[PDB]
Design a protein around this nucleic acid. Structure first.
Ligand SMILES: Nc1ncnc2c1ncn2[C@@H]1O[C@H](COP(=O)(O)OP(=O)(O)OP(O)(O)=S)[C@@H](O)[C@H]1O
Ligand SMILES: Nc1ncnc2c1ncn2[C@@H]1O[C@H](COP(=O)(O)OP(=O)(O)OP(O)(O)=S)[C@@H](O)[C@H]1O
Ligand SMILES: [Mg+2]
Ligand SMILES: [Mg+2]
Lengths: 333, 223
DNA sequence: AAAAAAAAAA
DNA sequence: TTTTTTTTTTTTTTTTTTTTTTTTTTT
């Protein structure tokens, strides 16, 4: 009797809103398919597990930060390569002015189809991101260093001139304008950030990140990447041992971590992960320094076991299939 | 929280602002009330909302393009008389139309603060007539040219501080561990403004990832 | 521990 | 006793509204 007048009043209000602002302006959450979380691969199997939903979320903002030579650029080029292989279009905003296109090709990027810009100002860089997002035609945008997004007033000015929170104000304005446009287009925006040290502190972490506080709030994922050691061929240093921590996650549980190798000129060692994961799920038996699959003794030392998996593609596919089915919280197939 | 009033919840990044606000909705829906979520941040996960106990099928949701559209939907739902709880996720993301049409770097002096001042004037009366609760989530920013007091401020100007009946400061004060596995957050809420009872009291509880607020954990500490 | 500049409406 | 005719001209203001954002070691 009284709850029936409410239903009518609600129906009228929903009608008026949808008439004034458009069709999908207000709906019930359960019947809105645009609100479902869709993910793409990072190129690392251990990081796809650490993220919980099987990769990085489309339509959202992501931040990757870390110290010098930690693998930030290499990780983003592996995301682009994985996305291009699924027929997605990708752009790269090189504000650092330090991208090598031969190295990009070696990591598996299609150089001929990758859009690239080397913008003069931070405002120009963030206006190009906004235009590509509104277009609806780009799936992945990478912005190499927030740290190098210089405001126009600071470029026109002199070295020593104070610009009080001008960069922080530009980023705060950029997040507001972009967040909505990225969601509508289903575009993934990745920001790379550098670490700076903060003075006037004794407690907590003195490590900070550049460009103000806005990006910490709007990011759906935040990744801290670090070099933890060297990969050696006796004498020759051939790569880096790498750790990634998930320090913020809005699509699954945070504070999981991933370990993997970056080999110079190849990128992320996929088979090296697949060994360590296959061992952890009891699909590979480790008898001291010997690796064995189903009784068959495959190698001794991780490098020989990795080389064995390389020259036998089918048995590697079998182990991948199992690890994928088992450890992923949300398998998508 | 009082019906027919405005409430503000603010805090740092990943402090539990959205989680707390979905637990209010879940509790209200179990008493037959109708609820709406205005997601200006464009970052609500509907499967997480379901895990916290929200009825996803009956929750009204809107992802609006401008701050003006967001606040016009709040006024329309308030006048209707049929919605009991409205949540607006970040004031910080309530972008004025002129700023969306403009270019990055363009100045818009106190335009967002002016929109918020206008919205409070229009909403306060309508919410009281409908008996509708409006919750604003806010983000923290640093102020410059300060040695006194707190350099922390909130977004969107000064109007919201005056019109709010309750203001809540939420903070993550530690990890909940199962040996090695981090399984949740230790959380503190301070009541920094109260017009319906005495202010400056505080609350401590756990948020467990995938469950929400640990009720039985509180019942132990109170018992 | 010391710093700066930004408009449009009946 | 008999029988109407025809427009002319302006006058004078009232009143504000609202913040936004960090930056960096040094030995
Ligand atoms: N063209 C290249 N050839 C061989 N090795 C490279 C090349 N470019 C980078 N590397 C190596 O790969 C590792 C990761 O490098 P990056 O991915 O550039 O790390 P990064 O964090 O982006 O570092 P920055 O931008 O210089 S602070 C480092 O050990 C580099 O020396
Ligand atoms: N879908 C999810 N699955 C698991 N944990 C989550 C999920 N969403 C949020 N959390 C965790 O719950 C805690 C509180 O998260 P929120 O309630 O989203 O905080 P918040 O203050 O709204 O943070 P923002 O909006 O991102 S600055 C954090 O540790 C999150 O990582
Ligand atoms: Mg780099
Ligand atoms: Mg939130």
């Amino acid at each position: 009797a009284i709850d029936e007048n409410k239903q009518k009043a609600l129906a009228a209000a929903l009608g008026q809103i949808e008439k004034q602002f458009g069709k999908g302006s207000i709906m019930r959450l359960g019947e809105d398919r645009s609100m479902d979380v869709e993910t793409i691969s990072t190129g690392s199997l251990s990081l796809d597990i650490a993220l919980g939903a099987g990769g990085l979320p489309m339509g959202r903002i992501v931040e990757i930060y870390g110290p010098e030579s930690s693998g930030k650029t290499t990780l983003t080029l592996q995301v682009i390569a994985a996305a291009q292989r699924e027929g997605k279009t990708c752009a790269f905003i090189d504000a650092e002015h330090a991208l090598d296109p031969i190295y990009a090709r070696k990591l598996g990027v299609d150089i001929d189809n990758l859009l690239c810009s080397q913008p003069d100002t931070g405002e120009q860089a963030l206006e190009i991101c906004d235009a590509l997002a509104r277009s609806g035609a780009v799936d992945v945008i990478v912005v190499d260093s927030v740290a190098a997004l210089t405001p126009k007033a600071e470029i026109e000015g002199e070295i020593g001139d104070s610009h009080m929170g001008l960069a922080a104000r530009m980023m705060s304005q950029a997040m507001r304008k972009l967040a909505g446009n990225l969601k509508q287009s289903n575009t993934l925006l990745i920001f790379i950030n550098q670490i700076r040290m903060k003075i006037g502190v004794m407690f907590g972490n003195p490590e900070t990140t550049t460009g103000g506080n806005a990006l910490k709030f709007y990011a759906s994922v935040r990744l801290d990447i670090r070099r933890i050691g060297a990969v050696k061929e006796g004498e020759n240093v051939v790569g880096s041992e790498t750790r990634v921590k998930v320090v913020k996650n809005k699509i699954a549980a945070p504070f999981k971590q991933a370990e993997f190798q970056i080999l110079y000129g190849e990128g992320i060692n996929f088979y090296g992960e697949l060994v360590d994961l296959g061992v952890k799920e009891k699909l590979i038996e480790k008898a001291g320094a010997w690796y064995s699959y189903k009784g068959e003794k495959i190698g001794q030392g991780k490098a020989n076991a990795t080389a064995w998996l390389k020259d036998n593609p089918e048995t590697a596919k079998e182990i991948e299939k199992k690890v994928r089915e088992l450890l992923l919280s949300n398998p998508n197939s």
